[PDB]
Amino acid sequence: DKLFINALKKKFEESPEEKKTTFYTLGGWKQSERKTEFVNAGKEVAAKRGIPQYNPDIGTPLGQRVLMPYQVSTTDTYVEGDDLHFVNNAAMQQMWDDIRRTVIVGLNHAHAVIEKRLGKEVTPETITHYLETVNHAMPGAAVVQEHMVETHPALVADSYVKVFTGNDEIADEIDPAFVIDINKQFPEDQAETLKAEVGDGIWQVVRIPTIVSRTCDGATTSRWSAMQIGMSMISAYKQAAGEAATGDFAYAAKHAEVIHMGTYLPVRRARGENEPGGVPFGYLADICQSSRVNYEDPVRVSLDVVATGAMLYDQIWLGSYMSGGVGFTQYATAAYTDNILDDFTYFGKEYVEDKYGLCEAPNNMDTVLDVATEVTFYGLEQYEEYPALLEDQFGGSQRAAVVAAAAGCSTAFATGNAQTGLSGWYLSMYLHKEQHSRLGFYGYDLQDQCGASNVFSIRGDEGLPLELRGPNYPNYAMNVGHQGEYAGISQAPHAARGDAFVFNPLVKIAFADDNLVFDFTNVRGEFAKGALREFEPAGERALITPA
Amino acid sequence: AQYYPGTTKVAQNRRNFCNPEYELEKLREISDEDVVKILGHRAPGEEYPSVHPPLEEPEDAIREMVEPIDGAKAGDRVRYIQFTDSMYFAPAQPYVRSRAYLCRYRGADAGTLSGRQIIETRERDLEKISKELLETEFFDPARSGVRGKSVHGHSLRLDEDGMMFDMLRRQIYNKDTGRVEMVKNQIGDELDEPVDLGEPLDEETLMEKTTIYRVDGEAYRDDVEAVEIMQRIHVLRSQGGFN
Amino acid sequence: AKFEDKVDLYDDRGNLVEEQVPLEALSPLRNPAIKSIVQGIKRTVAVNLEGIENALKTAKVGGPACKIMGRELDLDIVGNAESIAAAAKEMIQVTEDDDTNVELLGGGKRALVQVPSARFDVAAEYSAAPLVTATAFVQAIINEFDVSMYDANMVKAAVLGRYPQSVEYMGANIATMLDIPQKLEGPGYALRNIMVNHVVAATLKNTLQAAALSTILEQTAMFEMGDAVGAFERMHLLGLAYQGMNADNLVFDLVKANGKEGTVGSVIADLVERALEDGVIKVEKELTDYKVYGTDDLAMWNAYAAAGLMAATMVNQGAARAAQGVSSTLLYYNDLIEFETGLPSVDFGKVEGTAVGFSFFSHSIYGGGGPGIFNGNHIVTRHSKGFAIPCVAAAMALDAGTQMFSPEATSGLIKEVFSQVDEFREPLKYVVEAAAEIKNEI
Amino acid sequence: AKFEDKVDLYDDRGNLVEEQVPLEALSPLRNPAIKSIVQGIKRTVAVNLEGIENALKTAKVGGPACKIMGRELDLDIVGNAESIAAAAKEMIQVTEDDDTNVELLGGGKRALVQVPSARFDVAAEYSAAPLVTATAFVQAIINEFDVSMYDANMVKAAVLGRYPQSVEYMGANIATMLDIPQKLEGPGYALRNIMVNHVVAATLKNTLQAAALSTILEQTAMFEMGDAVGAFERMHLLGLAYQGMNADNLVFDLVKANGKEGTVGSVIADLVERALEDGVIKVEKELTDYKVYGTDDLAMWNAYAAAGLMAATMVNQGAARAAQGVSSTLLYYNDLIEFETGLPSVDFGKVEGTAVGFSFFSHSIYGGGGPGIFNGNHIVTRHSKGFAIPCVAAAMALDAGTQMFSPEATSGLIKEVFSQVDEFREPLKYVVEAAAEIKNEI
């Protein structure tokens, strides 16, 4: 059976193949539990504040068709689409906060300054003392000055500092409460690759409080991190609390050995560091931790990244940061609901596996023309044979993204190269446009028409490997239904290759951490949990507010 | 001109819509007043509101060589007509329209979306075009709809009568007459008197005239020559962008 | 000369001016008129003396709806504009006989300022023009009326606005064609961050002069960005010639042959005929009742297709006298020509892609605006490397008054002052002459 | 000449070279050597061919700790550096025998590239140098090894990094002295966003040559920023001459008279004596056992005070052979001299203010760093208009190895490549000679 058949049967009373149904007799918004909750809440809101708010009689009357429930892919959780709106989903808000409040800061230059400029010794015992110091200071507590006022430890309970290193012997000498154990979090072959990449380097993973991250912005993270690293360096290694050498630690922590989650953006979309637009597709694939728990199923790994990116890039980034309002919930849910993209991508995997074998296909246009065409035709035919499927993903943009994501990921499964996978993405768009004489919304295929010629370009603002591209790549900077899927195509060849990471091994290790609030090993499972209002986020002010 | 490759009925139907020498088959008669009523921009007999004074009221070789359309001479507003095409064998389809509009009509501003397709031009010239769009095989009163907003329906299942879903129900199928009546204008304002849109085409004629590829009609994967040209354009675009 | 191509140059009336001109004679790196055009844009500043006087008189400085009650200064700046402009020129100029130019317009309400080229020979970028002009007029106003130390800061706010608290010259009463370097979408984009309305305003709504000047600016930026380097240099030169310079009268003849009754589709058919006639394309393969065309010179096919694209804009938007349809023309001219021939469209799809988002961001809610507010440095219209914006300049020139944000609303100070420079108002004239003068030095 | 001042020019050894030179012969707007220095900085790019080869061989591209497994390309770039550099120069140059320069360094591991001036005559700013250089070497490497269409994008990533996803050339293997125009604190600041370590690196740690070059860059930017226009032009020229050019051997003589045993306070006392000796200052009023000094030429007093500031830095930080104390010298030389004389300190307090934050942001936790990482475009050190950064260049030149972030750590590619150009390495030589050659044209 197709993976989406069960979800389609849950949505409609008719058989999935039936072309006819009945409309207009469903009661409008009264058919929906969620819309009913919203109407009652809108009445209470307007009554309490004295200004009209939510009103189902404004504009056109929702609910002339079936207001569908959605199955979160890989789960058995069925929710109305409103429960997958990022405003209504605390798991989605916490996923972004966990990314926004994270920064990676090396200790290698700092330890060099301690031993050379200060002439003091660095040992695993001093590192442990520093880490115990920094985990007191990082949430906002004092270590040096008299009469300091501090943050409430319970309001900032999610902030901490951990370290990792490729040297197993050094890692075992640091207090294990502060260590991200690569050998426990990653499988053997992945752990050896990551430990070989890190080597003797020691790297901090800093997470600042969520309540600060929500109060301020992403650019606060690396600054907040550096201040408390600097204070703990002063305390733990007995510096003068403000001498010349203290400036080296500040420059080291703020610039020299710091890895931001997102780079800053240009003026038209002015934003500082650690905003979604600055997160390249390769980082996003590595932030997602599906690679270390589902490493035998490259489809599952690739689609968990799609879910991560589709929610972040389309719902939060493009749907709020860059636009706002009702937003782009269903533009993104098309990529992680009803097992639709899963069915399409498992087909392409099996097609590639039987014909070529994973990563065994030639890395040329012939493999692109073959795999992308076959998967696209399979995906588009499913909408033609299952009218309930076409009514489900009713927007052409939705369908174009799902079909091309399967075609792109499948082509990358074949070549082991993300760039030919990207070429398959755009070919899917061109074939899709001609098959149904439609594609996406008014401006969906700006990048799609620029796409083919810019896949292998080498010019200034055109040429980049897919892993290095992101929401700031000029063609990609505006439009829904692409960025989250591009992250999946970046993951696709490395998942098929068994690679431990897509673009940055430090980023991959930095989120293999059980003290995170959001579970990046089970992104879609977390989305379902937040939709059911069962997710416990950080950063709440309940402790400092009346009952 | 070749317009479009392929050997299917769909490919030929796309060439027919684009070719200005192909006379579109007229399927229904609609009065001039009904076209103005369906557009909903002005009442019948109301003067054309002007966005700028007439042209008669600088030196440029282009201006002197390009004859302006009648609405631009008078200074008419730029208004629109917008259609939604069901993916279940509607005769016209979104990209087919925009391609055909810019082959057949002068001074046309066409836009393509999955759930709607729009053309904007001078008001009095729009009325001339809308007559051909509504009376000919561009339009079917069951699988197509004139919708200025709330266009949801192009990808939905049909109702019991074979009508496309319409959130505002601008087009009503009459079981007693077997004909479709338009009770509202394209923006959703109720009309004083409905406009007869004729009988819906039967499924046999729909499949003969449709321009969408489907597995239960003519699949795009079966029009191997059309797919070949699209793959060729993809390869040539890739090579050109590289060198 | 690196390339063997030669082109015939024409004027804005379809008359032949010079035959067999080497392709590189039109290059921004070689053409002296293009060099004068680029340098003129860098160093020209408009000063709104009436705005400075009104801002000081009302203490309305520093941005929209801003005012500091109690700071008002009543100075007759326009009445003394001759003395003020003369005093400023003394500070702007390097020597008494450099190319410094300060002219009053509108009876002293405006001032055209051209900062001498000597200041830019020792400058890294182009910001010296507004910064030297602003401080010279600030000092000249203060010296003219002996403004006290305690009030002079209001003159500074009236001239340059809220800078440096704001990054831009927010609320300034001076204008240039370039924006501050911080607002570049990327390095090398400065010649693209020129609003189409600025070009249409100072070209006085002449279609060919706006189209030529837009192509000159767009393709010159392609050299600064490095796109027109090496393997791609000939493609951008051919596009500059055939799309923007009316090379071989191809754009002009196509518009004439389809101006009375033609459509976008008919311009395509004639272009494919002309391209097949001139050996640019040839039938490579035949399918079932369908000829697949090929070419051995993609750069030349792109130039011919770009010429037909420009003509399709002039035919389609000229008939409507409304610029808005240019985004549709840029899209479906390229869409139709690909399935008509089997060859890639202009810029290998980049114009069609630019047109898709340009259509969207000019017919929706998410941003953008009218066709006149866009430019090569806009996120929506930066993707095509010089082949799409020139068609918008021709379209906005033909617009009979259907745009809320026309050049009169956003480029009023530009149309009055920058149109006075003959190089920019009629750039097709000087560029064709310069190519002929250097044709035997290439 | 606008000003009557004349100065006597000396070399880096205290020897008189040319007497009674008009002040404006040292002006960036007039001096041909300063023009050669500024234009050379705009068009000079260093290419790390060894870094590109290592990035391709390991697929480590796009930023720190970044790698794409499976993308590795084994190309012998350094072994074929002669052919690659020759092909790149062919694309970089405009015409034959123009001022294009491509030289190999380190046996082909490095490449010095100087983009021809003709490309900048038609460009708005300076980004053409890295953008044309990067794409020429990308194309040259691809042509050299026939890199396939499917692999060429890795060569692009190896050369220019994560651009345009990042705003900067994040992870690039090319280097310039200027940064991207988007990173300017304000318009006209590009010549200030040059790290002090960059200047010290290519001056090979010569104190006077580093001080001259820093003053040349800082004060030239003051012209582009509009600060050195009109009422303030003479002050910046005098500061350029006396503080950076060793005018009248004042900095040299002050350093000589206090080099063996002197302190900042002793340099102040000698400077105040010299100003009183030369008629620059005079006793204006007498308090109780305290003489209040005045002046009729604040610009000249500022220049004399600026000379002693540079000399006090050379005496104080030279004795310590550690640059860090320059922030203290810049502060208390100005603090002490105001209560020593009753006259305003250098830049009317702006040097003292800059020093306060510079001391703070180089001895605390909130940012900044070592003295070598600062520049005129840094938020901490942008406030003094050209009178403070040159003293930091002189101090870092005297640092005997006490800095973690020295020029060897942050400016290694600059020290190897940009020092090869004689104009940049020894700017005091050429600027003094050029001023003498034009002394009768001013």
Ligand code: F43
């Ligand atoms: C007013 C526009 C023009 C514009 O700039 N944005 C609109 C409306 C905007 C609003 C609608 C909110 C509301 O209803 O009040 C929002 C939610 C953005 C916002 N401001 O919050 C949005 N669209 Ni739109 N918009 C969507 C879509 C679409 C599809 C729907 C086609 C169909 O057949 O139903 C078409 C484009 C196309 O034809 O491809 C579409 C058009 C349009 N989109 C037409 C309205 C069309 C109509 O009259 O019905 N969107 C989609 O394709 C699916 C996702 C969906 C978005 C909400 C979500 O993701 O949950 C929403 C995204």
Ligand SMILES: C[C@@H](OP(=O)(O)O)[C@H](NC(=O)CCCCCCS)C(=O)O
């Ligand atoms: C284009 C640009 O808008 P402006 O044209 O500059 O108003 C930009 N917005 C966007 O890119 C909108 C992206 C999100 C909404 C569209 C999703 S398809 C911005 O707000 O800076």
Ligand SMILES: C[C@@H](OP(=O)(O)O)[C@H](NC(=O)CCCCCCS)C(=O)O
């Ligand atoms: C100096 C500069 O830092 P950098 O030297 O660039 O690392 C700057 N920070 C600050 O000004 C810190 C301000 C808050 C801490 C000091 C308060 S007295 C900034 O991050 O842009």
Ligand SMILES: O=S(=O)(O)CCS
């Ligand atoms: O109709 S538009 O495609 O502009 C809006 C899509 S959400």
Ligand SMILES: [Mg+2]
């Ligand atoms: Mg949990």
Ligand SMILES: [Xe]
């Ligand atoms: Xe994996």
Ligand SMILES: [Xe]
């Ligand atoms: Xe212009």
Ligand SMILES: [Xe]
């Ligand atoms: Xe455009």
Ligand SMILES: [Xe]
């Ligand atoms: Xe230098």
Ligand SMILES: [Xe]
């Ligand atoms: Xe400084």
